[PDB]
Amino acid sequence: DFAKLAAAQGDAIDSRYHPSAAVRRQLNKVFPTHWSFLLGEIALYSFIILLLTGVWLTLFFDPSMAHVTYDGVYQPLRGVQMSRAYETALDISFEVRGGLFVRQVHHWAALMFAASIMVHLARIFFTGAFRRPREANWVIGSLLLILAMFEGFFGYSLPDDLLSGTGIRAALSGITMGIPVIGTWMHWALFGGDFPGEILIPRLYALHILLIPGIILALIGAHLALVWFQKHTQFPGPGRTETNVVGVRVMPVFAVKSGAFFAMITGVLGLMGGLLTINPIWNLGPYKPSQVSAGSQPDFYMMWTDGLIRLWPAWEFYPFGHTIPQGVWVAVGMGLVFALLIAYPFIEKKVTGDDAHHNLLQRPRDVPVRTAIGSMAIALYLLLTFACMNDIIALKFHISLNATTWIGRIGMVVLPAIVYFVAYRWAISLQRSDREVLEHGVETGIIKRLPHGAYVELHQPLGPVDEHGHPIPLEYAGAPLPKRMNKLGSGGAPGTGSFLFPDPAVEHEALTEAAHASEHKSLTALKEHQDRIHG
Amino acid sequence: TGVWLTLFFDPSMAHVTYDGVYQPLRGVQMSRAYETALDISFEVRGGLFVRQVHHWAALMFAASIMVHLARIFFTGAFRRPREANWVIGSLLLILAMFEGFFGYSLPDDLLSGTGIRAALSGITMGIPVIGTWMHWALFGGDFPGEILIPRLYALHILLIPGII
Amino acid sequence: MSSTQDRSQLDPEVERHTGVDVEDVPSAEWGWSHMPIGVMHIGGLLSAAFLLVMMRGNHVGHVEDWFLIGFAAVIVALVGRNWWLRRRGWIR
Amino acid sequence: LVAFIGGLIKNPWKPVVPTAEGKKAVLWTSGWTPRFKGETIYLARATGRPGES
Amino acid sequence: MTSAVGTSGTAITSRVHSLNRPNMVSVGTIVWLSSELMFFAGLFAMYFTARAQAGGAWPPEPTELNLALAVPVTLVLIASSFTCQMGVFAAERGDVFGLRRWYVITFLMGLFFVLGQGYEYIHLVEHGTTIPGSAYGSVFYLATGFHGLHVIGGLVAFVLLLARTKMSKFTPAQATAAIVVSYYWHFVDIVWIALFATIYFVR
Amino acid sequence: QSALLRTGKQLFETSCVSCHGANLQGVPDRGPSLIGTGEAAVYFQVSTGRMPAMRGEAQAPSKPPHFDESQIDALGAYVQANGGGPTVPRDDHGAVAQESLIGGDVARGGDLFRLNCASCHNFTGKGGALSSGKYAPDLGDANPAQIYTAMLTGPQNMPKFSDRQLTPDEKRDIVAYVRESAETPSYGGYGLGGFGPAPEGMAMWIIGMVAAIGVAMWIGSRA
Ligand SMILES: CC(C)=CCC/C(C)=C/CC/C(C)=C\CC/C(C)=C/CC/C(C)=C/CC/C(C)=C/CC/C(C)=C\CC/C(C)=C/CC/C(C)=C/CC1=C(C)C(=O)c2ccccc2C1=O
Ligand SMILES: CCCCCCCCCCCCCCCC(=O)O[C@H](COC(=O)CCCCCCC[C@@H](C)CCCCCCCCC)COP(=O)(O)O[C@H]1[C@H](O)[C@H](O)[C@H](O)[C@@H](O)[C@@H]1O
Ligand SMILES: CCCCCCCCCCCCCCCC(=O)O[C@H](COC(=O)CCCCCCC[C@@H](C)CCCCCCCCC)COP(=O)(O)O[C@H]1[C@H](O)[C@H](O)[C@H](O)[C@@H](O)[C@@H]1O
Ligand SMILES: CCCCCCCCCCCCCCCC(=O)O[C@H](COC(=O)CCCCCCC[C@@H](C)CCCCCCCCC)COP(=O)(O)O[C@H]1[C@H](O)[C@H](O)[C@H](O)[C@@H](O)[C@@H]1O
Ligand code: HEM
Numbered sequence A: 001d002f003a004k005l006a007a008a009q010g011d012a013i014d015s016r017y018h019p020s021a022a023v024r025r026q027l028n029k030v031f032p033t034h035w036s037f038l039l040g041e042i043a044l045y046s047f048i049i050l051l052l053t054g055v056w057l058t059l060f061f062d063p064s065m066a067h068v069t070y071d072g073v074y075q076p077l078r079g080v081q082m083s084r085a086y087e088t089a090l091d092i093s094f095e096v097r098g099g100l101f102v103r104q105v106h107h108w109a110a111l112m113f114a115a116s117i118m119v120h121l122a123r124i125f126f127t128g129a130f131r132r133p134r135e136a137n138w139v140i141g142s143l144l145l146i147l148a149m150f151e152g153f154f155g156y157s158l159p160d161d162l163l164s165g166t167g168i169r170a171a172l173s174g175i176t177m178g179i180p181v182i183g184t185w186m187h188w189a190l191f192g193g194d195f196p197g198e199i200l201i202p203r204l205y206a207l208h209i210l211l212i213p214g215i216i217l218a219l220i221g222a223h224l225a226l227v228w229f230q231k232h233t234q235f236p237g238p239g240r241t242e243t244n245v246v247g248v249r250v251m252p253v254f255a256v257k258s259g260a261f262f263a264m265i266t267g268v269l270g271l272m273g274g275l276l277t278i279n280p281i282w283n284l285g286p287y288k289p290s291q292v293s294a295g296s297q298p299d300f301y302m303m304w305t306d307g308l309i310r311l312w313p314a315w316e317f318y319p320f321g322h323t324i325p326q327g328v329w330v331a332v333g334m335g336l337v338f339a340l341l342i343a344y345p346f347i348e349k350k351v352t353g354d355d356a357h358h359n360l361l362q363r364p365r366d367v368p369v370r371t372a373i374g375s376m377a378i379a380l381y382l383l384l385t386f387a388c389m390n391d392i393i394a395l396k397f398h399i400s401l402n403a404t405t406w407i408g409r410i411g412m413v414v415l416p417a418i419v420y421f422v423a424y425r426w427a428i429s430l431q432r433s434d435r436e437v438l439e440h441g442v443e444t445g446i447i448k449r450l451p452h453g454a455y456v457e458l459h460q461p462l463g464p465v466d467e468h469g470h471p472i473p474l475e476y477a478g479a480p481l482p483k484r485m486n487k488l489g490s491g492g493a494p495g496t497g498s499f500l501f502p503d504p505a506v507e508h509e510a511l512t513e514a515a516h517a518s519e520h521k522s523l524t525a526l527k528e529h530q531d532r533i534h535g
Numbered sequence B: 001t002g003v004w005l006t007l008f009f010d011p012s013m014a015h016v017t018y019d020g021v022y023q024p025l026r027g028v029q030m031s032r033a034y035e036t037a038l039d040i041s042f043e044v045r046g047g048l049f050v051r052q053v054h055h056w057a058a059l060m061f062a063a064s065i066m067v068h069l070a071r072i073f074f075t076g077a078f079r080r081p082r083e084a085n086w087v088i089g090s091l092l093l094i095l096a097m098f099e100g101f102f103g104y105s106l107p108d109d110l111l112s113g114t115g116i117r118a119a120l121s122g123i124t125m126g127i128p129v130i131g132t133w134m135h136w137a138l139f140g141g142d143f144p145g146e147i148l149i150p151r152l153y154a155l156h157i158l159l160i161p162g163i164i
Numbered sequence C: 001m002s003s004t005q006d007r008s009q010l011d012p013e014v015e016r017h018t019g020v021d022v023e024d025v026p027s028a029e030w031g032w033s034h035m036p037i038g039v040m041h042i043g044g045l046l047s048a049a050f051l052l053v054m055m056r057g058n059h060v061g062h063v064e065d066w067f068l069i070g071f072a073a074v075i076v077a078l079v080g081r082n083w084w085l086r087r088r089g090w091i092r
Numbered sequence D: 001l002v003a004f005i006g007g008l009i010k011n012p013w014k015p016v017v018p019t020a021e022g023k024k025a026v027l028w029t030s031g032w033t034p035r036f037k038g039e040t041i042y043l044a045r046a047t048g049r050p051g052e053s
Numbered sequence E: 001m002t003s004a005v006g007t008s009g010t011a012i013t014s015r016v017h018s019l020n021r022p023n024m025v026s027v028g029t030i031v032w033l034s035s036e037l038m039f040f041a042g043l044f045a046m047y048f049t050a051r052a053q054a055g056g057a058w059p060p061e062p063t064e065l066n067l068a069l070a071v072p073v074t075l076v077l078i079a080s081s082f083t084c085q086m087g088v089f090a091a092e093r094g095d096v097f098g099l100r101r102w103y104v105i106t107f108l109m110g111l112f113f114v115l116g117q118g119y120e121y122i123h124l125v126e127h128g129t130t131i132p133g134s135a136y137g138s139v140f141y142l143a144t145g146f147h148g149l150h151v152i153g154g155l156v157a158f159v160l161l162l163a164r165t166k167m168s169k170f171t172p173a174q175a176t177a178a179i180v181v182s183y184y185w186h187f188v189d190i191v192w193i194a195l196f197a198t199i200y201f202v203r
Numbered sequence F: 001q002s003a004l005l006r007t008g009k010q011l012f013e014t015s016c017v018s019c020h021g022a023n024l025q026g027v028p029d030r031g032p033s034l035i036g037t038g039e040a041a042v043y044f045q046v047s048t049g050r051m052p053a054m055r056g057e058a059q060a061p062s063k064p065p066h067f068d069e070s071q072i073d074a075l076g077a078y079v080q081a082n083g084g085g086p087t088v089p090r091d092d093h094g095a096v097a098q099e100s101l102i103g104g105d106v107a108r109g110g111d112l113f114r115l116n117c118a119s120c121h122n123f124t125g126k127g128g129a130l131s132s133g134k135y136a137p138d139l140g141d142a143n144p145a146q147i148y149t150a151m152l153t154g155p156q157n158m159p160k161f162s163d164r165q166l167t168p169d170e171k172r173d174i175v176a177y178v179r180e181s182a183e184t185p186s187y188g189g190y191g192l193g194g195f196g197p198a199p200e201g202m203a204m205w206i207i208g209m210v211a212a213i214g215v216a217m218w219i220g221s222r223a
């Protein structure tokens, strides 16, 4: 009554619907097993956490700006005027059982979300997963990053703790007023009044439960549909031509490791949602516009923005009776970088000439100027971030505060040039380091030559050898070639027994002969498939 | 309409005096849900129209669900291929009904505040074993428990319309 | 020794004529591998011009303007040396 | 589209706040401005007492 | 492949040879042991003055210096020296399991030494001296505490070499690694015999 | 006691008169004047340790104390007899009062610390950066009498929150806040500093995201 009822309900599902065609198409789909192809899954797998916590945070949070005295449990805030957003965020922190944990693992899931989006953008950038067939997928993923950034900024500003209330005052109301023609108009449309306009926090709650995460969920749905139906890309390797995806199928293997990786991402978020404090809004105060911190720094995925405020050197213009302030520039500048980050595949489609349907990836050493432009962007992000904690860097690492913001202000101009030089020539030297492992072998320990005194490194060749001390030099194929005989089948047979006690020797012989024959069968089947493609 | 109504409505039960434009409610204690629903009605340009066409769209929604249930019932559109479609449509009717009830109770106008007192708090207390417990879990307190209207706003923007 | 060969037929491509030869960079057909060099010359020169424009601001510490002159003169010296060596064909 | 946006678009330069000159807009008006003529606007501190004075 | 050109027992080789050739990681860790002995000479000279200074009953009044918890953990550590030497006897004769059993129990009672020294530090700071509290308390906390860092680094070497025995075939190079970590840690607990004679017995 | 003034003078002559001129004056462009600052100022500036200092830099930082409580009273009464100003609050034993200074309220101290000064330091009293090399220090290693005499006579770049700017009820109230904000544990995990999002970012990357990418490279292979 456990397999018979499964067969009966399966024939019922096949009777009502006719799914088995469009289920077999799904659970025979192959995803490749490279590790970096899990990175964007983190941006999925934390995002579901952001719903599963976040829904829970919706049914306790009360947005308002109606000024209430606390009269609750938290003693250093009693009788103090606070917005009811902050009061019920304090109630999430201290009243409800396991409430501080759910809101902390929610904030940590937001950090892992907006950081894994950046890690995965680094993946699909430097591996070249964005040219011709997947450029719209880059565009909707880039827009998904923009919505992630703005929506998280609506997130930690949603209680008006004053560390983020001054973040609204800096970013969302100083830059918004600082836009030339229609700046004040979109400010007073966004707030409905002055800066503590009484319908800001509920408007952010409206945009932040549903209105931006509805668009984020729609773009993730269409995004994973573009990854799903239009097949996944892959690195080139042994049996990996342009028009096939090699790897594991969905049903026995990929579903198990994907669900287990969802569970381990949730484990990392839960461990660091418990063991590490985040946004301690009771240590912070209610937002009152006459008191600040010293840090006053945003969350890290937006620290490149007002760090760009912290580094742009006070250039204001004054036309005939008006004022362009500094905040126009970064309102241009954030509009600049996004217009380079959305529209990059069309930019280098124009520059390079990549008018070809690319499915195989390119290793990020194989494309040195694009990896170097990318490392310019990575190090420029790291500079604009690492000079946004300008304050606390100059605090702890004892530097003059003026000195470290000048270090940033020169660094955003000269350090992309330095990292472009180092990145371009480092990619070319990584190419040359695995283009001499083909013309020579793989390096090992030293033998001396017998009749005279020499020292050869005793290279182990990768392909066919000639009759003498040099092999037939292979051609490059976009693959990671192994540079250690370690990573080949050399000395990789320890005792199979236990960590403390050995198994009997016939069992060791059976296990190592069976595993050796299975690995031999793996490379034999992959090699004969590779010969079937060309032959 | 409803997205448009989210970015003007402020749910609360913090008691505010009106001090706005509507003259027969001035200096009267009101929840801020009711105060910003009055602001949707009278402050914003074309606001009363969008919230009214929102309520009429809710009526045409929950009435056309009943008309269409009459269609697929009496025409027999629910047997062997499509009984799961009947089940998820029926659950969709249940969520439509409960979610609209969370809807017109979301401003606490007292015509629907007494609807919360009758339906959502008299029937909820009136359940034998675990009745008072699910009442005090749903409200967090007494009947004007200060986290009812934001919980209905939470269930009513996203949490029930996400399932819908 | 427990490895197979690797063979990848890509879509190889301007189409393999103008750019960098496959002996300057060891894999030029496998991806985009040459920025045009006037772009990086004018990028360095415009970087140094931006560092020289950065004097204009709220400013009393003139110990910084010597860093701006220094990091601008280093970039102008590198760009000028690099352009002069390509004007003479990498000589002296 | 204007029915979407028209509920949002407020004029920041509608004269709202009463001032000594008359009704000025909000950006040219803090709470430091006089309401009718020279009135005593005391530079009072905020002793952070919970509510009473 | 054809067969290989580096047809050896592993990708790792011994370090040169050890039948008519000295082992080279052996002499490397011997001279680095000698350097760390000079590091302990720096710590001993920070001890043997600031004991010529304090006169009379010189270990000060809050330092009820516990010997009844000191001499059991020294006895644990120097019996663990013989467990580690039995591990290298089972490393010369080439079985990973005789290595791993004796190094697991050597790591366990070396961890017991580290936890006993940590409990001695807790029990001697909570009703006694602190490192800004005394001269003798500070030199006691640094002359044996950075020895605690030496033995916790030796424990890191034990767990690290045990994972290394998990991941590869037991070569003579790995017996070289085992004998090197073996008498690094033998140096650690001969320096601790020197420190335990110095601090507690000789004073 | 006049012998206590003499003890203050004996310690004064042999520690500072290279930078205070031995008539309690200011040695010009080497050390400022010292009269009028008083016993409270000398208690905070030597009991913390700071002013028996060694260079004139961006700001003279914290250090171990160069004199003890049996001598700070001598040195502060000597500077108050030569000058005269704010004095350190003392209990019914004549010693420096350090526990009777924590006020009976914290939330008023929270709002008043937060308004009046937590711009400079932090919310819980961690450090904050200042303009040209100078910086606010952490308030964790701060004796409550040093906190009262820190705000009472402002040493370096901080305003002297006087006896009339903040009343002693308010100052006892602020030192009630900071000795139970830099002392209370971080509710709900490790306190990544006191200031929020930059340590939370850096501990997202190398603790959380490095572990996430390590799991992702243990699960998936590489090719
Ligand atoms: C890939 C690249 C961005 C190319 C895009 C195309 C480019 C031309 C578009 C224009 C961009 C240019 C003009 C301006 C730069 C602005 C910038 C790109 C803003 C967009 C946001 C986003 C795309 C940022 C870039 C992606 C991000 C930096 C990738 C992460 C770095 C790497 C590759 C991932 C692995 C790192 C992982 C293993 C952890 C290692 C630990 C290291 C120390 C982390 C570094 C680090 C980081 C990255 C923090 O953000 C951070 C924030 C707060 C505190 C501390 C840290 C911190 O230590
Ligand atoms: C992870 C490792 C990172 C290592 C990075 C190491 C940093 C490189 C060198 C930095 C040199 C810093 C020297 C600063 C010394 C200094 O204090 O000078 C100040 C201002 O100088 C300056 O900042 C100019 C120097 C700018 C440096 C150029 C930047 C180079 C780039 C490439 C480095 C960026 C690295 C960022 C890393 C991020 C990660 C990237 C992957 C003067 O202003 P100030 O002191 O406040 O005022 C004065 C009164 O104090 C005083 O009494 C009175 O007398 C007057 O002088 C008055 O003006
Ligand atoms: C997303 C698409 C973006 C498209 C933007 C361009 C489309 C513009 C269409 C709107 C046209 C005007 C609609 C009617 C408006 C009208 O009649 O305009 C009067 C005086 O303006 C004017 O002539 C100037 C009109 C020029 C428009 C300038 C603003 C354009 C954009 C850039 C602003 C951004 C908006 C979207 C971003 C915000 C994001 C939100 C999440 C207001 O005087 P006021 O006295 O404040 O009356 C108040 C009642 O309006 C008000 O509803 C009522 O609430 C009362 O407050 C009442 O006081
Ligand atoms: C296992 C069973 C479950 C038990 C729960 C385990 C979860 C931990 C929470 C339990 C309570 C512990 C938190 C204590 C309460 C607490 O907040 O933790 C403070 C933070 O202090 C410090 O840092 C010193 C701590 C040093 C320890 C090691 C540091 C942690 C590292 C590993 C974090 C990694 C971050 C990423 C590195 C970035 C990479 C860079 C390349 C330490 O308090 P304390 O030392 O006594 O005094 C404070 C003064 O530090 C403070 O300057 C003073 O201002 C006051 O706050 C005072 O109270
Ligand atoms: C799209 C991805 C999301 C991100 C990056 C994000 C980010 C954040 C962040 C950083 C906070 C501040 C948490 C704190 O420090 O207390 C927050 C709060 C919140 N989140 Fe989200 N969120 C996301 C989606 C959602 C969703 C889908 C929901 C509900 C269905 C939700 C509900 C909430 C609520 C109600 C709050 C405010 C309560 C509080 O902050 O204590 N979030 N969010």
Ligand code: HEM
Binding pocket: A210, B001, B002, B003, B005, B006, B009, B037, B040, B051, B054, B055, B057, B058, B061, B062, B096, B099, B100, B103, B104, B105, B106, B107, B156, B157, B158, B161, B164
């Ligand atoms: C699932 C179908 C829905 C139904 C049947 C429904 C029903 C209602 C009803 C009857 C009201 C009361 C209107 C009034 O008399 O003022 C209401 C209000 C509201 N609706 Fe919905 N609604 C639905 C979906 C949504 C969605 C999807 C959103 C937002 C994305 C939304 C946003 C709102 C808001 C914020 C209010 C309160 C503002 C006000 O009542 O003035 N509704 N809803």
